[PDB]
């Protein structure tokens, strides 16, 4: 109802206003090209690895923390930036009544339109932000591995040499030694 | 010996609206309207 007293939310003529905080839901090991992962429950982005010792999932906490920070700032800015009781007239004040309706019905359309535009553009910005973050992780893993691994398409790499758990999390935390595992990769690449 | 990069999904049926597509399913969403 538009007549409110106290500290009250703003009235709009909208049926739904929903804001995105997460990602698109495309269910169904390949990488980000084929789809999303149901089995990852400890983060928004991450890694899946398989080697001789085993296989499993992980999470990239620093990218998830940055995503949480942008989402919190965006929603709080939307709440913060968009921060009567009624009048009576007699029979010989019709022009006043029409002017008062015109003011009251002209402000409400503007505020409804502003809220609906803000939601519809920020949803697009959020989804593009998530896609760019996944691309950034793929580029960092590509740049650190260079020529030791083969891209199968589909956001995945095949190691030419032998990569154990310490090797996998050395790729994961951002410190990978290029000259240490070069020669076996060169021999396995040239032998194929 | 493989490493792959992907994202996270769940069973959620929340739908949002964009400028290309309507009724887009998202993993998490927040509501700003009270009824």
């Amino acid at each position: 109802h538009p007549v409110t007293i106290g500290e009250c939310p703003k009235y709009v003529r909208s049926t739904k206003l929903r804001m995105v905080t997460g990602l698109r839901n495309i269910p169904s090991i390949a990488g980000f090209i084929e789809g999303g992962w149901t089995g990852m429950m400890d983060g928004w982005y991450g890694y899946h690895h398989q080697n001789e010792q085993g296989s499993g999932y992980a999470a990239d906490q620093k990218s998830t923390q940055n995503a949480i920070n942008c989402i919190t700032n965006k929603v709080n800015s939307v709440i913060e930036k968009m921060n009567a009781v009624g009048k009576e007239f007699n029979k010989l004040e019709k022009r006043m009544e029409n002017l008062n309706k015109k003011v009251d019905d002209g402000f409400l359309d503007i505020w409804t339109y502003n809220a609906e535009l803000l939601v519809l553009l920020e949803n697009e910005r959020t989804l593009d932000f998530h896609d760019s973050n996944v691309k950034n992780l793929y580029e960092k893993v590509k740049n650190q591995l260079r020529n030791n691994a083969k891209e199968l398409g589909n956001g995945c790499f095949e190691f030419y040499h032998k990569c154990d758990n310490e090797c996998m999390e050395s790729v994961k935390n951002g410190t990978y030694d290029y000259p240490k595992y070069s020669e076996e990769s060169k021999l396995n690449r040239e032998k194929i | 010996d493989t490493i792959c990069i992907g994202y996270h999904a769940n069973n959620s049926t929340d739908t949002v609206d964009t400028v290309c597509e309507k009724n887009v399913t998202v993993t998490h969403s927040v509501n700003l309207l009270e009824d």
Partner: antibody
Amino acid sequence: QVQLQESGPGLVKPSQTLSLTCTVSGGSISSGGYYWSWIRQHPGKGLEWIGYIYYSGSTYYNPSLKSRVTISVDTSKNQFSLKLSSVTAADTAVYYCARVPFYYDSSGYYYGNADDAFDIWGQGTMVT
Amino acid sequence: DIQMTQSPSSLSASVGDRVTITCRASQGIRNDLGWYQQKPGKAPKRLIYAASSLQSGVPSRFSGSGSGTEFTLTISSLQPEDFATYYCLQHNSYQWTFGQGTKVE
């Protein structure tokens, strides 16, 4: 509300092993990105880190005390356990089990309930 | 093997005084520090997440700042229930190291 509590014998002779179990009452072991950690304090000293484990089974242990340590998670019983050895008078101390969250989410955007963003600690057990 | 340092170990002030306390690290730790408050004979409680974000429920008299090698915690006004010991915990690497301890009186 999630509560952590500890159980252990507390009567350990030198050059023998020691086991403690931290159990969860309430919302169980949640797959949401929490360090499940053991942190110890000697009476008359400072706080010292033992080590943490994740839901999957990946474990990380203190480099100085990597002699005989074991951590283990039983999901169906909502329990996790710590195994030490050669408990001397320096090792006789107070143990705490803790649930440290991965991310800081003040407004509730990632973890949905607002109690799921709390660093809930254990009561603490004196082991001699 | 990163080590913390805190100074001074003892703080004495009356009720209503501002207390500024420092935790210093040698390495370039990017905002990975948390403040724990310990009552005597009781479990610690978290106060600040990542050196600049208060946990929900913490009163507004507690504030934190700092970046890089040094970090600071500020208390605007004391109370008789503020007798505790304060620690700084880092989580930059996989290794976790605490502070030595600062008693307030």
